[PDB]
Design a protein around this ligand. Structure first.
Ligand SMILES: C[S@@+](CC[C@H](N)C(=O)[O-])C[C@H]1O[C@@H](n2cnc3c(N)ncnc32)[C@H](O)[C@@H]1O
Ligand SMILES: C[S@@+](CC[C@H](N)C(=O)[O-])C[C@H]1O[C@@H](n2cnc3c(N)ncnc32)[C@H](O)[C@@H]1O
Lengths: 242, 242
């Protein structure tokens, strides 16, 4: 059995008793049901890991004894900024979880013409909150000791205007080329993946106007959430740490 | 936009009047509520797309008239054999779907040491039916006109003994070799992926001894079902049609 990893930002040092955050301590003592003397690895989002053991469980609060600090970085050298068309429900959560597993540096939810979602300020905020916790959960899972940035949703126009990454790719069949036709390598990539219905010709004219080049992923139509993970897999395997 | 795709095995020809299989009629007649006169693209599993029109719908009996046949092959030239350790519930469903979207040729459900599944012949024949249907659904969605082969569950020990693919790979986070260290090319490749708990040292011992060579997918630990998506994406990108 592997050791449990818990996100706990902030600075602290070995030998120090730490009171776990509300969510951290509620994860450990309540959800995981762990007891005094059990072991834990904490990470702070800054690429450090802290070995620890549970000493006192008082209600939902959890106190942990730090054993040692170690600098452990599992980031890819290829920084990909995913711009993912918003899908309803579980598929978007799937993308949030697995794109973090695949080293994604930064995620922008994208509102595009053929997205089928209701854009409510209250609703969007809840989604953003839920998405960030899924990301942190995936980072506890996969070993990343730095949380990827989850940026506020923007329309296609804004994102394509502000995009400054050195390689800029959109998943779209027309005039597309495979990963071998592009210079996939650090520093960074902007990657647009669209909604189930795809993109309008006007949207392609706008993205193509701002330097986004068309990338294919084989002759089979991939689902929207499949396409994110496949695209990240292929780009990391080409010019990252896969 | 594009016509609804329905898997319909068997032999049939342009100009025939054809009664759809019960599951196909259920899908067309009840789920999708399709009307007489609407169009279907049937595929029989032999890289043929039949254009047909719905001539009568009576609950879940559906009769179509075949108009034309077109040979259309969306199979990867790399034949990948995924042997996926069996995981709980919806994780394995994701593997079946994504791997068919990704062009997998053959799937073997795999029983490894740390799998936590009750070996029940009633459960397992049922589960094999549910996995098959997820696969078939995936070919309908993604455009494969040929169903991947779904084999019976076998234990790791037997699978590794019997494997005959020209390139054999075992996926484990504590490896360092990447896809670039191997001749990933036709005809075929066998790939072994572990459960949520991974492989034991004994299993790594066993598979290495039977010629499965070590493959890593970067320094982050992927969920069992993420690893199937990433591994197939990378292998199709390297030697298939991605
Ligand atoms: C990834 S798809 C999202 C929709 C997905 N089919 C679903 O069910 O949710 C978004 C757009 O990406 C494009 N796309 C999908 N697979 C592709 C591929 N293999 N090569 C190039 N573009 C692709 C398609 O044009 C699609 O309209
Ligand atoms: C959740 S992982 C198993 C974790 C477990 N603690 C272990 O490593 O022994 C499930 C499967 O995904 C595959 N996998 C996950 N990350 C991988 C990586 N970075 N490189 C190669 N295989 C990986 C392995 O085949 C593993 O058995």
């Amino acid at each position: 059995v592997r050791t449990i990893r818990i996100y706990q930002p902030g600075e602290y040092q070995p030998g120090q008793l730490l009171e776990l955050s509300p969510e951290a301590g509620q994860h450990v003592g309540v959800v995981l049901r762990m007891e005094q003397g059990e072991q834990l690895t904490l990470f702070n989002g800054d690429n450090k890991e802290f070995t620890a053991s549970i000493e006192r469980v008082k209600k939902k609060q959890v106190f942990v004894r730090i054993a040692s600090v170690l600098e452990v970085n599992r980031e890819s050298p290829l920084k990909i900024h995913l711009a993912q068309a918003i899908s309803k429900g579980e598929r978007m959560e799937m993308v949030m979880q697995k794109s973090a597993e695949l080293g994604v540096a930064c995620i922008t939810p994208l509102i595009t013409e053929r997205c089928q979602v209701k854009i409510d300020k209250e609703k969007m905020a809840k989604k953003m909150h839920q998405w960030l916790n899924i990301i942190i959960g995936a980072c506890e899972q996969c070993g990343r000791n730095q949380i990827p940035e989850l940026r506020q949703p923007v329309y296609l126009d804004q994102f394509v205007r502000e995009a400054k990454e050195h390689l800029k790719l959109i998943l779209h069949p027309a005039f597309s080329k495979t990963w071998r036709d592009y210079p996939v390598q650090p520093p960074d990539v902007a990657l647009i993946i669209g909604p189930e219905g795809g993109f309008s010709d006007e949207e392609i004219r706008l993205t193509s106007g701002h330097g986004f080049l068309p990338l294919s992923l084989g002759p089979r139509v991939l689902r929207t959430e499949t396409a994110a993970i496949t695209a990240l897999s292929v780009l990391q395997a080409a010019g990252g740490d896969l």
